[PDB]
């Protein structure tokens, strides 16, 4: 196993830089480990040790405990809102001071790690939402891949009627909500203030709740969508590009990947950007930080980017990745990699507020579950979310 090879590499190493992550397994965990094994081989007495912390929520809980225990790793994965939280504690090294070169990092991704003009993270494993679909089922009913929200609803209705069950599958969560909210003209910040209960928020949540009532949308309440496949007819889902390998292994049908339905055919829908940046903690030693500098330079290299992104369906974060022949060979044999990069052009983020992790799961996510699972009124559910978010922010 690659994590055994790493335990061994670090055992002989003069300096070990720990990297805490939230990859539980599959292609992402494996791709991270393969990258680390290759880096660790180039060094003499200098190594990275990846340490799985569970999922992403677990990782930020454990990073907060590590601050309270006074023992943080050298590097960790972080969302933009976690970077914001760690900056309140002044806990992050500025990346460009470390000596990492950022020319050629995608500005979509670089702007998101820049706080008061200073970059505090290295875009690493950046996902974009895509439309997964059942190529077999759309072909059986002569339904084209939908390019607009209108067409998507119409297709889900037609196919659900035909197959006797709801064919648009979704988790009732903030990530799914974001797709429909952004594409109905929603924004979360109104003159600097967080608003969860805007008319576009009510519209988005009402669209999903109506799709359940109308028999075209299927709430997935236990596991990833890709873990529920094979139970009833499936046409479509909106999911992160990093689910690609999970969908591929699970699907008994011919899986497709398309750009997201938008307001019009003039442009694909916006997708939510997910996945994480790597940060470097101030508490690391000069020697651990030097390992981080070389590790981050390696992760931004065209070949590392090419291998990582083709092994997983993460978006390659540099312009040079798309010029690498290994990326080019993968793309030539599989049109889904270009589809994911094309979608990555039409990209929105959630707010970069320190409290956003709590808000998205415990407040916004709960309001969406209330509406979807318990037929709560959408406006009443989001009005309660607004008050709980304002109270949290005021505390
Ligand atoms: N903590 C925290 N999480 C956040 C925040 N913003 C968004 N997210 C979560 O990012 C996940 C997307 O990140 P991504 O790296 O694109 O994809 C993950 C996995 O989701 C996906 N996966 C894993 C196993 C499996 O069977 N299927 C599969 O698709 O593969 C990758 C590695 O595990 C969403 C999913 C969510 O966990 O339910 C909540 C969302 C935040 O601010 N904080």
Domains of the chain are 2-125+275-344 (3.40.190.10), 128-272 (3.40.190.10)
The token pair at 204 is: 């988005």
Q: Is 175 in the pocket of ligand 1 (CB under 6 A)?
A: yes
Q: Give yes or no for a contact between 223 and 139, defined as CB atoms under 8 angstroms apart.
A: no
**Candidate from 77, 83, 121, 175 with most ligand 1 atoms within 8 A of CB, to mutate:** 175
Look-up: residue for tokens 């009913």?
Answer: 141
The token pair at 344 is: 């990555």
Which atom of ligand 1 is the closest one to the Cα of 82?
42
Q: Give yes or no for a contact between 132 and 228, defined as CB atoms under 8 angstroms apart.
A: no
- Ligand 1, atom 42, lies closest to the CA of 357
Q: Give yes or no for a contact between 203 and 149, defined as CB atoms under 8 angstroms apart.
A: no
Rounded to whole angstroms, the Cα distance separating 328 from 32 reads 21
Look-up: residue for tokens 């972080």?
Answer: 78
Judged on CB neighbours under 10 Å (0-12, 13-18, 19+), 83 is buried
Rounded to whole angstroms, the Cα distance separating 198 from 221 reads 26
Q: Is 79 in the pocket of ligand 1 (CB under 6 A)?
A: yes
Angle at 94 between CA 91 and CA 96, to 5 degrees: 165
Which atom of ligand 1 is the closest one to the Cα of 223?
26
Rounded to whole angstroms, the Cα distance separating 381 from 374 reads 10
Q: How far is the CA of 354 from the centre of ligand 1 (A)?
A: 18
Q: Give yes or no for a contact between 90 and 279, defined as CB atoms under 8 angstroms apart.
A: no
The token pair at 163 is: 């197959």
List b or e across 293-331, with b for residues whose CB sees 16 or more CB atoms inside 10 angstroms. bbbbbbbbbbebbbbbbbbbbbbbbbebbbebeebeebb
- Cα 176–chain centre separation: 12
Rounded to whole angstroms, the Cα distance separating 250 from 252 reads 6
Q: Is 125 in the pocket of ligand 1 (CB under 6 A)?
A: yes
Rounded to whole angstroms, the Cα distance separating 277 from 123 reads 4
Look at the alpha carbons of 212, 217, 222, 224 in this order and tell me if their dihedral is positive or negative: negative
């Amino acid at each position: 196993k690659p994590e055994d090879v790493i335990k061994e590499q670090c055992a002989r190493a003069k300096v070990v830089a720990e990297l805490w992550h939230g990859f539980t397994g599959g292609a992402p965990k494996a791709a991270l480990e393969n990258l680390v094994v290759e880096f660790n081989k180039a060094q003499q007495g200098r190594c990275v040790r990846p340490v799985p912390q569970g999922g992403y929520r677990d990782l930020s809980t454990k990073i907060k405990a590590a601050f309270a225990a006074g023992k943080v790793p050298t590097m960790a994965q972080a969302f933009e809102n976690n970077i914001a939280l760690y900056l309140e504690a002044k806990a992050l090294l500025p990346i460009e001071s470390l000596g990492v070169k950022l020319q050629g990092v995608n500005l979509t991704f670089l702007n998101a790690v820049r706080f008061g003009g200073v970059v505090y993270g290295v875009p690493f494993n950046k996902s974009i939402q895509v439309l997964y679909y059942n190529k077999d089922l759309l072909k059986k009913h002569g339904v084209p891949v939908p390019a607009t929200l209108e067409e998507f609803v119409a297709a889900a209705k037609k196919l659900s009627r035909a197959e006797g069950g709801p064919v648009y599958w979704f988790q009732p969560d903030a990530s799914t909500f974001a797709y429909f909210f952004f594409n109905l003209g929603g924004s979360y910040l109104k003159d600097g203030k967080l608003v969860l209960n805007s008319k576009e928020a009510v519209e988005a949540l009402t669209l999903l709740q109506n799709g359940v009532k109308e028999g075209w949308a299927k709430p997935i309440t236990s596991g990833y969508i890709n873990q529920n496949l094979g139970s009833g007819p499936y046409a479509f889902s909106v999911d992160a590009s990093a689910g690609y390998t999970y969908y591929l292994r699970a699907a008994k049908f011919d899986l497709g990947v398309a750009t997201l339905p938008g307001r019009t055919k003039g442009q694909p829908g916006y997708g939510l950007v997910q996945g994480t940046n790597l940060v470097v903690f101030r508490q690391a030693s000069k020697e651990e930080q030097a390992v981080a500098k070389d590790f981050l330079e390696f992760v931004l290299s065209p070949r590392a980017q090419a291998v990582f992104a083709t092994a997983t369906g993460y978006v390659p974060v540099t312009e040079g990745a798309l010029k690498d022949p290994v990326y080019q060979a993968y793309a030539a044999e599989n049109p889904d990699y270009a589809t994911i990069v094309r979608q990555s052009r039409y990209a929105k983020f959630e707010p970069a507020l320190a409290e956003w992790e709590q808000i998205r799961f415990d407040i916004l996510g709960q309001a969406i579950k209330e509406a979807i699972l318990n037929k709560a009124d959408p406006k009443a559910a989001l009005d309660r979310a607004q008050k709980l978010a304002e109270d949290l922010l005021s505390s």
